């Protein structure tokens, strides 16, 4: 009898896009953790998600009008940044999330040692 060898399964786009210096593990529900030190002023982006002109919605304004929302729910429609959870307080927070040129970027507020969860808050 013949034995069958399957293809290597294909992971979702969100997962494949993950920077090698980061890992996915359960959040404080999947979250993004550091596999090594991430220096202050390290920037990630832009966010990729489903564009449409809950808890997973980014608002893009342009010249004072809400142009569209990015929704970050579907692993096939987003990059890895859909996995980054929102800090629950100002202590825990280590990424600032902000629009630039109509796209969302996350930037480290401080050096983040290995084995820390990435946790965002909005800029001012």
d(CA 95, CA 84): 10
1-124 fold: Beta-clip-like (2.170.270)
Tell me the DSSP string of 18-72: --TTEEEEE---EEEEESS-B-TT-EE-----EEE---SEEEEEETTEEEEEEE-
**Which residue in this structure is represented by tokens 């996915």?**
24
Domain coordinates of the chain in residue numbers?
A: 1-124
Q: How was this structure determined?
A: X-ray
State the resolution, in angstroms: 2.2
Per DSSP bridges, beta strands 65-71 and 22-26 are unpaired
SS3 14: helix
Let me know: does 107 contact 44? Beta carbons within 8 Å. yes
């Amino acid at each position: 009898p013949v034995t069958f060898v399957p293809d290597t399964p294909i992971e979702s786009r969100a997962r494949l896009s993950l920077p090698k210096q980061l890992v996915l593990r359960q959040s404080i529900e999947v979250g993004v953790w550091t596999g090594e030190t991430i220096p202050v002023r390290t920037c990630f982006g832009p966010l990729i998600g489903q564009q449409s002109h809950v808890n997973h919605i980014w608002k893009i304004y342009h010249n004072g009008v809400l142009e569209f929302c990015i929704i970050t729910t579907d692993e096939n429609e987003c990059n890895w940044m859909m996995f980054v959870r929102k800090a629950r307080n100002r202590e825990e927070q280590n990424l600032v999330a902000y629009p630039h040129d109509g796209k969302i970027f996350f930037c480290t507020s401080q050096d983040i040692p290995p084995e820390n969860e990435l946790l965002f808050y909005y800029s001012r």
